[PDB]
Design a protein around this ligand. Structure first.
Ligand SMILES: Cc1cccc(C(=O)NN)c1
Ligand SMILES: [Zn+2]
Length: 258
């Protein structure tokens, strides 16, 4: 037994091994655009990725992570709702078996084909492990994907997936520029939440961009050829690796735009 996204180990089961699954600050949520409030005190998001150093891409059995060197302030998120400096450590995606589902956050109940998560940790806590013991330890930039024209800056990711088909496989993945995954606008919604995977820790300032990026059908098709399983095990396609919306409870979603 291990947590996953199948019928017997999927999101409705996670609370048995991770009781915080039923906590007060869980993610993702539905973003109700008519309840989120414009906050004029929010600052523009500051994305400083010019010196980003990607290292490796890893199939971890539930998604693929592109990992970055976080030993210095090489790729950081500042501003927006944040106080201080958050260092990029990895990004990954969530996607569906079909174009009509795949995102974790929803917008007025709309599900996008996929969702990108760029995970950052607050440098005042020194490392990622200590950051995930804090309520302001992490900032995750979430970006929706819709199917349309291809995303050129995603193609290098797509093209290496054949080399990390199964759980535990990794490949060198240097000189990848995450700026090629951003939309034009950096307007966003923000709310306090959690990791959307076990251990579901409630450490995240979520910053979800309003504007989706467009990726081609072929690009997301290649995501769906990955495997949850390890090599030599029965093939289980890596699809529908998203957690559904959780109760908002006593939280407010703020908008950077009106
Ligand atoms: C390890 C970590 C930290 C923050 C967010 C996530 C996530 O988006 N999981 N799907 C994962
Ligand atoms: Zn995620």
């Amino acid at each position: 037994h291990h947590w996953g996204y199948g019928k017997h180990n999927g999101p409705e089961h996670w609370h048995k091994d991770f009781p915080i699954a039923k906590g007060e600050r869980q993610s993702p949520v539905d973003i109700d655009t008519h309840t989120a409030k414009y906050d004029p005190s929010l600052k523009p998001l500051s994305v400083s990725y010019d010196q980003a150093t990607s290292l490796r891409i890893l199939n971890n059995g539930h998604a693929f992570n592109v990992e970055f060197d976080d030993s210095q302030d090489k790729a950081v998120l500042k501003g927006g709702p944040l106080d201080g400096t958050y260092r990029l450590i990895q990004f990954h995606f969530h996607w569906g078996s079909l174009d009509g589902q795949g995102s974790e956050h929803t917008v007025d109940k709309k599900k996008y084909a996929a969702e990108l998560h760029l995970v950052h940790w607050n440098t005042k806590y020194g490392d990622f492990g200590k950051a995930v013991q804090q309520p302001d330890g992490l900032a995750v930039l979430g970006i929706f994907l819709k199917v349309g024209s291809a995303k050129p800056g995603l193609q290098k990711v797509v093209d290496v997936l054949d080399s990390i088909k199964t759980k535990g496989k990794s490949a060198d993945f240097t000189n990848f520029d995450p700026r090629g995954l951003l939309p034009e606008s950096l307007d966003y919604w923000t709310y306090p939440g959690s990791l959307t995977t076990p251990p579901l820790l409630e450490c995240v300032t979520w910053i979800v961009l309003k504007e989706p990026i467009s990726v081609s059908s072929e690009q997301v098709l290649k995501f769906r050829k990955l495997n949850f399983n390890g090599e030599g095990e029965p093939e289980e396609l890596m699809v529908d690796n998203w957690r559904p919306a959780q109760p908002l409870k006593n939280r407010q979603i703020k908008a950077s735009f009106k």
